[PDB]
Design a protein around this ligand. Structure first.
Ligand SMILES: C[C@@H]1O[C@@H](CC(=O)O)[C@@H](O)[C@H](O)[C@@H]1O
Ligand SMILES: *C(=O)C[C@@H]1O[C@@H](C)[C@@H](O)[C@@H](O)[C@@H]1O
Ligand SMILES: *C(=O)C[C@@H]1O[C@@H](C)[C@@H](O)[C@@H](O)[C@@H]1O
Ligand SMILES: *C(=O)C[C@@H]1O[C@@H](C)[C@@H](O)[C@@H](O)[C@@H]1O
Ligand SMILES: [Ca+2]
Ligand SMILES: [Ca+2]
Ligand SMILES: [Ca+2]
Ligand SMILES: [Ca+2]
Ligand SMILES: [Ca+2]
Ligand SMILES: [Ca+2]
Ligand SMILES: [Ca+2]
Ligand SMILES: [Ca+2]
Lengths: 114, 11, 114, 114, 114, 11
């Protein structure tokens, strides 16, 4: 199944933050309606934040997270969780190798803000 | 059912 | 129901990261076996990271998040989500006021690391 | 935090199913737009299904689950989870006593159907 | 990623329930420790329960859900959610066709029971 | 709430 694609409400500000846990340098691309809106890159095996930014979900609300290592797409896993009918998390894990820890880049999208 | 099912098989 | 308490695997490293979305200064306390292991503080209405740290879950694996604003406990909401039976997120929202947005401090715990 | 309240897509069919795990007879009230749309009453300590029904979220999409035992409201926990941006679960647990297993009535709402 | 595989606490009773929403007859296999422990089958486009059972997770706690429709494995999506650090749901959706509603067989695993 | 105190500081 497709993973890393989320329908946010249209015109909604959201946070996106990525953490790295891999020997490979992680490249996280955040697309808003199929156009790159942010790109984070970095290397850590200790959960370092490799980027955090506030974006707007735009007219469509469609947000897509893509993770690669030197251009190679990682395998993605994802879900959206809503707490108390108000607080939204869109979560992505990614696997760039063979050990299935799925933490190699971890991406958290949260909304609403403010 | 029907359409989409057969096309998925042929491709 | 009790919120903001999670059982991690014992003796395991995890990441904890807090974001702020409120006029009020947020104080996030992270307890490992009922002792304060980290405290983050800051104020933002734009999802600023007010802290991120790697901790060990200790003997019990019990990790609790508490949030207060000028000493007053916020109301908490929480859940844990596991993706592909490997990647864990423990999620906390908190409410310091009357608008039920539960983003006033948002805390994300993730494991495993590395 | 409020629990057991979910905003579904409006005018959408959804399943609701309740399981019981308590000595107490469980009454589950499912409200659509603030009006009771289904009630289940049953008793089991072995996770028996005490009801299942297809409902429609109506013009507002507001769905609320309430659980009571001998007229006493149970304490609720809930969350919504979305898989592959398409498949939705709204989940409710409830506690009628003091052991905090929160399974005394478990309620699962799923959509889409068909 | 692998989907529909969960590590439950070992030697623990859990419920497993399947719903169908497809023209195709669904066959849902539940494996514990790599051996078939239950098989549900049925056809519905109205979310009918096609099976519910209590099982024991055994010495390994390993539970796997597989879904087949007209001789082909369906594509699976899954996640585990924990509420109030106590109430667990392991959720599976599956797609037998092209519409990607992922509801063709929906499987809910819940624990603890009783 | 909180803006009362930051404005008292800023102004
Ligand atoms: C340090 C390792 O780096 C990668 C593999 C090598 O390289 C990751 O896939 C592993 O999960 C682990 O983080
Ligand atoms: C056709 O067999 C496809 C199939 O059945 C449809 C009625 C609908 O439920 C669809 O999602 C499913 O894949
Ligand atoms: C007693 O009525 C308490 C009640 O029933 C028990 C059998 C157990 O399921 C408990 O969790 C529930 O609250
Ligand atoms: C005080 O004004 C309320 C407080 O700060 C607001 C800016 C908003 O973030 C609100 O959710 C928070 O409770
Ligand atoms: Ca890896
Ligand atoms: Ca890794
Ligand atoms: Ca608030
Ligand atoms: Ca806020
Ligand atoms: Ca109970
Ligand atoms: Ca019980
Ligand atoms: Ca389908
Ligand atoms: Ca279907």
């Amino acid at each position: 199944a497709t993973q890393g694609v989320f329908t946010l409400p249209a015109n909604t500000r959201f946070g996106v933050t990525a953490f790295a846990n891999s020997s490979g340098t992680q490249t996280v691309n955040v697309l808003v309606n199929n156009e790159t809106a942010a790109t984070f890159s970095g290397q850590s095996t200790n959960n370092a934040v490799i980027g955090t930014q506030v974006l707007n979900s735009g007219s469509s609300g469609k947000v897509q997270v893509q993770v690669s290592v030197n251009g190679r797409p990682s395998d993605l896993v994802s879900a959206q969780v809503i707490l108390t009918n108000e607080l939204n998390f869109a979560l992505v894990g990614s696997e760039d190798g063979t050990d299935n820890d799925y933490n190699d880049a971890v991406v958290v999208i949260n909304w609403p803000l403010g | 059912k029907x359409x989409x099912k057969l096309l998925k098989l042929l491709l």
